[PDB]
Amino acid sequence: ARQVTIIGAGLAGTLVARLLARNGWQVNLFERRPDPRIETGARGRSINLALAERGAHALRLAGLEREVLAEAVMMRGRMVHVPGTPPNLQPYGRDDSEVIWSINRDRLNRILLDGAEAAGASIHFNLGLDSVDFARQRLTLSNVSGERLEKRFHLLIGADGCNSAVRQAMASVVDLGEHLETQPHGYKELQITPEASAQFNLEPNALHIWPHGDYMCIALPNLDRSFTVTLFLHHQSPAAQPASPSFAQLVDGHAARRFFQRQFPDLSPMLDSLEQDFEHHPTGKLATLRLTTWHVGGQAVLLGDAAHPMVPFHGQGMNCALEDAVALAEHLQSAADNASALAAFTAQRQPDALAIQAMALENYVEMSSSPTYLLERELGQIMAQRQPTRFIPRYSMVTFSRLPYAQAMARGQIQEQLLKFAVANHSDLTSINLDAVEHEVTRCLPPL
Ligand SMILES: Cc1cc2nc3c(=O)[nH]c(=O)nc-3n(C[C@H](O)[C@H](O)[C@H](O)COP(=O)(O)OP(=O)(O)OC[C@H]3O[C@@H](n4cnc5c(N)ncnc54)[C@H](O)[C@@H]3O)c2cc1C
Ligand SMILES: C[C@@H](Oc1cc2oc(=O)n(CCC(=O)O)c2cc1Cl)c1ccccn1
């Protein structure tokens, strides 16, 4: 049997461990954290993720989709909150087949861990990768207390997240051609209790947004009607706008409360533990990291966040990481040798990872914000109705289909260009020749 060592029992690592182990590979998975399945008296994390078609299909191939979805809340659309007006729902898709699912990260990880072990993978927790000796095919791991342990490896998979130790180790043997692009927004997680969400009639079957231009809040529901709120706000106020809100101005929980009372007045009464959450939850960082190289011969490869950290605004980090795990397991299973599998995997996935990194950055303006846009959107809706296999809004191609990300971006561009020229110099729909716009759709967009 072929052997593989995987670093990181996260989302991509555990899925790839299950896929390889059920195909007879000898799989050893190393994880820095403790096993979340061992019940402790600790107060566990309430992180929510939006699972879409790419991630759902990956779980489906692994036989874990039904179990994951039993524990997922349907989000039918985007509920936009602007003070004084009732929330505007905005369906994501055409029917209940075109939805996103809100899943608790810890519930998903336990399912994936059980799945990897059921398939035959051995999982070793409380062991963090420190360094790799590529020449001797040996790695060094340690616990939190610093006690070191060495292990031999044949194939190394770096599924160890955005601050990947495998990626850092690879940089000593190859030029990764690494380009880090920082993002000015930090993030803070806040809670809405089931009692508060019910009292304020917050819809459980939707993704909620409180747009505020340069900053915003989002909320994802849980099975028990609680919601995890995420505030996106600049770490620092720019030089040009020193008065503009930022985390640097929010000195403590009380300042955060004052800020929410002023800027998010319909949201502040639902956040009962705002002051404590603000002070005890750390401010997260966001970034895009692009690498020219994802592998070292046939010895090691990166996937998921280890390969392509992206900004969170499209909810595609996990979906892309799960899609990578399927592609990696497929390439490894059927290749002539590991070196061929890793080069083929990298060549296939890199253009698509670059496309989703770009689309995730573009989605911030779509969430946090024009009559021209409204007319384009209305025309876009008519074209999707008239031509459903040709005109598919970019959000739907990314979220509800498995079309390669680079193709969704290219088609999305043809559509934006088509709508722009069609609405130009028209105040409303009545002056636009709809049949001529439809002819342009049939001429420029091949059916999918
Ligand atoms: C709060 C939050 C919400 C998110 N919401 C969404 C969402 O709505 N939709 C979406 O698609 N994506 C979302 N994402 C992004 C998504 O979580 C990631 O893109 C995804 O988890 C990447 O999967 P991964 O397996 O590559 O990495 P991870 O899931 O981060 O797993 C990496 C694993 O490696 C372990 N590890 C790290 N360093 C070492 C080491 N040196 N040695 C050993 N083990 C190590 C970590 O402990 C972890 O278990 C969210 C991210 C955050 C932070
Ligand atoms: C929860 C996640 O934030 C998102 C998840 C998301 O899922 C999605 O479908 N979208 C787009 C929704 C839309 O355009 O209507 C989306 C956006 C964000 Cl910021 C997050 C929290 C904190 C750190 C990193 N990630």
Numbering used by the authors: 7 to 375, 379 to 457
What are the paper's exact sentences on this?
Kynurenine-3-monooxygenase (KMO) is a class A flavoprotein monooxygenase (FPMO) which catalyses the hydroxylation of L-kynurenine (L-Kyn) to 3-hydroxykynurenine (3-HK), using NADPH as a co-substrate. We therefore turned our attention to the homologous bacterial P. fluorescens enzyme, Pf-KMO, which shares 34% sequence identity with the human enzyme, but lacks the transmembrane region and had been previously extensively characterized by Crozier-Reabe et al.. The KMO monomer consists of three domains: the α+β FAD-binding domain, an α+β domain containing a six-stranded, mostly antiparallel, β-sheet and a C-terminal four-helix bundle domain.
A structure of GSK775(B2) in Pf-KMO confirmed that it binds within the substrate site, with the oxazolidinone core overlapping almost exactly with that in series A compounds. However, the pendant pyridyl group does not reside in the water filled pocket as modelled in Fig. 4e,f. In addition to the face to face π interaction with FAD the pyridine also makes edge to face π interactions with Y193 and F238. Flavin movement creates a new solvent channel that opens the active site to the protein surface, the pyridine nitrogen of GSK775(B2) H-bonds with an extended water network within this opening. R111 needs to move in concert with this flavin tilt, but few other protein changes are necessary to accommodate this movement. The apparently non-competitive behaviour of GSK775(B2) can be rationalized by the unexpected slow dissociation of the prebound inhibitor relative to the timescale of the initial competition assay (∼2 h half life for the KMO-GSK775(B2) complex). Crystallographic complexes of our extended oxazolidinone inhibitor series (B) rationalize their unexpectedly high potency, by demonstrating that they bind with this intriguing variation of the flavin position.
